[PDB]
Amino acid sequence: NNVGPIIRAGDLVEPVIETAEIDNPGKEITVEDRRAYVRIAAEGELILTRKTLEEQLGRPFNMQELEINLASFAGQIQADEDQIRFYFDKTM
């Protein structure tokens, strides 16, 4: 039931990996590194907050920048101006 983003933009990969680690403490994070198609996943749920991403990037950041640079993703999303949550929904 692994879920999470697949990142197309090379310059967001490390910031998103680190955000995944920071905003999902204790969870196993798996990365499948392939050029321009980096899968980042955790079981059940993976949250990425705007605050953490901004801090990893060290400059102003809006969730749109992550979203427009997703190649795809696993799971369902709930997203707003503050965060995106990838999650597994057993009914779909």
What is the helix content? 25-40%
Q: What is the CATH H-level superfamily? A: Monooxygenase component MmoB/DmpM
**Overall 3D form:** globular
Named at the architecture level, the CATH assignment is Alpha-Beta Complex
How many domains is the backbone divided into?
Answer: 1
The biggest beta sheet reads: 4 strands, antiparallel
The third-level CATH topology is Phenol Hydroxylase P2 Protein
Encode the helix/strand succession as letters: EHEEEHHEEE
Number of helices: 3
Strands, total number? 7
PDB class: oxidoreductase
Keywords: catalytic effector protein, aromatic hydrocarbon catabolism, monooxygenase, toluene oxidation
Assembly: monomeric
Entry title: Crystal structure of a toluene 4-monooxygenase catalytic effector protein variant missing four N-terminal residues (delta-N4 T4moD)
